[PDB]
């Protein structure tokens, strides 16, 4: 109900969710592109 | 988004379709255009001939 902070709980999750947005939004536009462009194709 | 998918693939399916279904219609054309022409020439001939033959 109340929010609890600490810094010791998400400093390890930012890491993790911004190397995978990174190289998701990386190898995922690049096969969705592809994938595209087959279509347009 | 998927119907837009859709849509957008079907036009341009339906587009190399229509440019199949244009070539062959027009391979039909010429092959009717040239069915004609020799009916023509060939036609005249063998009345001249059957003419000739009766002309003479």
Redesign the interface.
């Known amino acids: 109900f109340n929010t609890d902070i600490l810094a010791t709980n998400l400093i390890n999750l930012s890491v993790v969710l911004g190397v995978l947005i990174f190289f998701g939004k990386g190898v995922l536009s690049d096969l969705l592109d592809n994938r595209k462009q087959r279509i347009l194709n | 988004l998927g119907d837009f998918?859709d849509k957008?693939?079907a036009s341009?399916k339906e587009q190399l379709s229509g440019v199949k279904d244009t070539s062959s219609e027009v391979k039909q054309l010429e092959e009717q255009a040239n069915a004609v022409m020799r009916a023509a020439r060939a036609e005249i001939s063998a009345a001249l001939n059957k003419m000739k033959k009766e002309t003479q």
């Open positions: 998918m957008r693939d341009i």
